């Protein structure tokens, strides 16, 4: 018999992004080919199968720095981190291959699906 | 020129609630008249003007335990904590006064608004 507030999840995510932009309560640095990205472990886990696995590991859950595979492109990661905190994906002809490869590595199934569809349309 | 994934914010919140239910990466205990509630500081801040003010304070941001005013009802808090993580509010004739009072104290404006409207309809 609950009532539901339609905009609540969006408003929560908007506030989480405001905290990220002001570097409030960020608890991890993600290192991508020397580029550094500060974030909240819980948001990373909520969006990515890879971060979910990393931060549920009894040893890795305590790390303040995570280094990604050197093949990962920092721009592709940046676009995906922005998507995690906003639901908006900056998908462009010039970045689609790097975004899809990063989303496959991060295990972000819905992003991989839209990249596959956008690539299929251009062939 | 971004594309947007409609269900992303809801899916993020659903995963944050799964982490809460499994007590994963919870970093604070909220004490309400001896009852204890584990949660994520970032989610509390994203939903409540009171928690936002508390955890942006340079001393309180580091506390692992927060004690609420003794007038706060633990059931009212529990219903509001559930709403924070789900967008669903269990509003009932028997709890509406305690829920509104707790939402006013926590500074959850949209919850206060619906409680005022539901109370006005019964008079």
């Amino acid at each position: 018999s609950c009532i539901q507030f339609t905009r609540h999840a969006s408003d929560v995510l908007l506030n989480l992004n405001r905290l990220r932009s002001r570097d409030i309560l960020t608890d991890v640095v993600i290192v991508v080919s020397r580029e550094q990205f500060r974030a909240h472990k819980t948001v990373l886990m909520a969006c990515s199968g890879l971060f979910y696995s990393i931060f549920t590991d009894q040893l890795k859950c305590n790390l303040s720095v995570i280094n990604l595979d050197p093949e990962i492109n920092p721009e592709g990661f940046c676009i995906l981190l922005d998507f995690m905190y906003t639901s908006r994906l900056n998908l462009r002809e010039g970045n689609i291959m790097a975004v899809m490869a990063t989303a496959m590595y991060l295990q972000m199934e819905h992003v991989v699906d839209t990249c596959r569809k956008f690539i299929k349309a251009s062939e | 020129s971004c594309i947007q994934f409609t269900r992303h914010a809801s899916d993020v919140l659903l995963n944050l609630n799964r982490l809460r239910s499994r007590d994963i990466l919870t970093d604070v205990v909220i004490v309400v008249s001896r009852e204890q509630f584990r949660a994520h500081k970032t989610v509390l801040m994203a939903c409540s003007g009171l928690f936002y003010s508390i955890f942006t304070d340079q001393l309180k941001c580091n506390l692992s335990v927060i004690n609420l005013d003794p007038e706060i009802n633990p059931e009212g808090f529990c219903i509001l904590l559930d709403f924070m993580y789900t967008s669903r509010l269990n509003l009932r004739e028997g709890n509406i006064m305690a829920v509104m009072a707790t939402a006013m104290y926590l500074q959850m404006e949209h919850v206060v608004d619906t409680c005022r409207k539901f109370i006005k309809a019964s008079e």
């Binding site: 609950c2 009532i3 539901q4 507030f5 339609t6 | 669903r88 509010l89 619906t114």
Partner: peptide
């Protein structure tokens, strides 16, 4: 607010 809605009935979910």
């Amino acid at each position: 607010w809605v009935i979910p």
